[PDB]
Design a binder for this molecule. Structure first.
Ligand SMILES: c1ccc2[nH]ccc2c1
Length: 349
């Protein structure tokens, strides 16, 4: 007995999250529709923020006010460029609104708050870009951009988990944990996608890091600077790896198996992707991905328990530890963080 509003939301879930839709749809029914609503709302936010054919005069209010649109039956939007990939989510958004309002009031307050905080951070970002540079210059800015597009997702999901008693409530008292969750994923994708993003005039690597390796960011992609480029990505990987232990801390707080799988799978994939990118020069030439046999192993190792997941983390931390070379100016610090991850897992298990 699935309503068509529900079928549409799940259809759009397949079309926007692609492979991830499968693990979302295996979520415990207490949070299956809430998490689905949460994702389609944030994806609806992205479809507005990313369409450069929408002028700031129109886009900025939609982003700041989107939390209030969730309360308006039949809200639609057809002002995307006719070729935006996820247009139809916003033109048929009345299904998300229907299912948003069917949600328990505690879930609606969480999703509405995150939509509000996130949409306004996006609107602030979209504004600066139009009237300024908006280039990531400091690690602090880098970390701030990741908190708004990914750390806030972690807050929302954690708030839903704790509300459904699927997560230890102490996860809300230590918000560095869900922040590390989102930053680990977002930083790994920013590292791996650096060429793709640069070929679309998007640059998220902080100048505080890449300026120690090249004079201009574009220099990273020239074949003659492949050595400094590797060293730069190494420090990028080092910065991402500093979140891994707090990620293990967060997963230890999850109390329901389908919620564990939903959070553990992307984390295990992130550390594998990080290991594939570490000292890999292909990262600056194309989009590299982990092999299908590896991804399929990881999916088995991320859908069991915390012990099995920690062994996967220990394995890829050791692989990064071994690829680490003294020629790298980040040599010592990479070994230290890898050792801390390995020795921490050895202490638990
Ligand atoms: C758990 C916590 C934070 C997250 N960010 C994206 C997915 C996800 C899962």
């Amino acid at each position: 007995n699935e309503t068509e509003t529900q079928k549409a939301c799940f259809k759009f879930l397949d079309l926007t999250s692609r492979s991830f839709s499968a693990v979302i749809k295996e979520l415990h029914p207490e949070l299956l529709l809430p998490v689905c609503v949460f994702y389609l709302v944030l994806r609806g936010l992205d479809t507005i923020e990313d369409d450069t054919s929408i002028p700031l005069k129109t886009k900025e209010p939609m982003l700041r006010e989107f939390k209030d649109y969730l309360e308006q039956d039949g809200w639609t939007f057809d002002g995307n460029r006719p070729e935006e990939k996820d247009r139809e989510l916003l033109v048929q958004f009345h299904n998300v609104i229907t299912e948003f309002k069917n949600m328990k009031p505690a879930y609606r307050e969480i999703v509405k708050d995150i939509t509000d905080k996130m949409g306004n951070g996006m609107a602030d970002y979209c504004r600066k870009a139009e009237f300024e540079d908006a280039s990531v210059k400091t690690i602090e800015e880098y970390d701030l951009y990741c908190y708004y597009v990914a750390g806030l997702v972690g807050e929302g999901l954690t708030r839903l988990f704790v509300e459904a008693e699927f997560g230890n409530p102490a996860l809300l008292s230590r918000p560095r944990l869900h922040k590390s969750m989102g930053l680990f994923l977002q930083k790994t994708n920013i590292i791996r996608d650096v060429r793709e993003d640069h070929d679309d005039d998007r640059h998220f690597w902080p100048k505080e890091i890449w300026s120690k390796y090249v004079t201009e960011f574009e220099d990273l992609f020239k074949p003659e600077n492949r050595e400094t480029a590797l060293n730069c990505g190494s420090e990028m990987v080092l910065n991402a790896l500093e979140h891994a232990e707090e990620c293990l801390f967060y997963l230890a707080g999850l109390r329901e198996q389908s919620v564990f799988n939903f959070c553990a799978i992307p984390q295990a994939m992130a550390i594998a992707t990080l290991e594939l990118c570490f000292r890999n020069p292909d990262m600056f030439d194309r989009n590299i991905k982990i092999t299908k046999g590896e991804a399929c192993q990881l999916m088995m190792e991320s859908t069991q328990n915390l012990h099995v997941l920690c062994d996967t983390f220990r394995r890829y931390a050791r692989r990064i530890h071994k690829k680490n070379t003294p020629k790298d100016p980040n040599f010592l610090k990479i070994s230290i963080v890898c050792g801390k991850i390995e020795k921490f897992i050895d202490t638990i298990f």
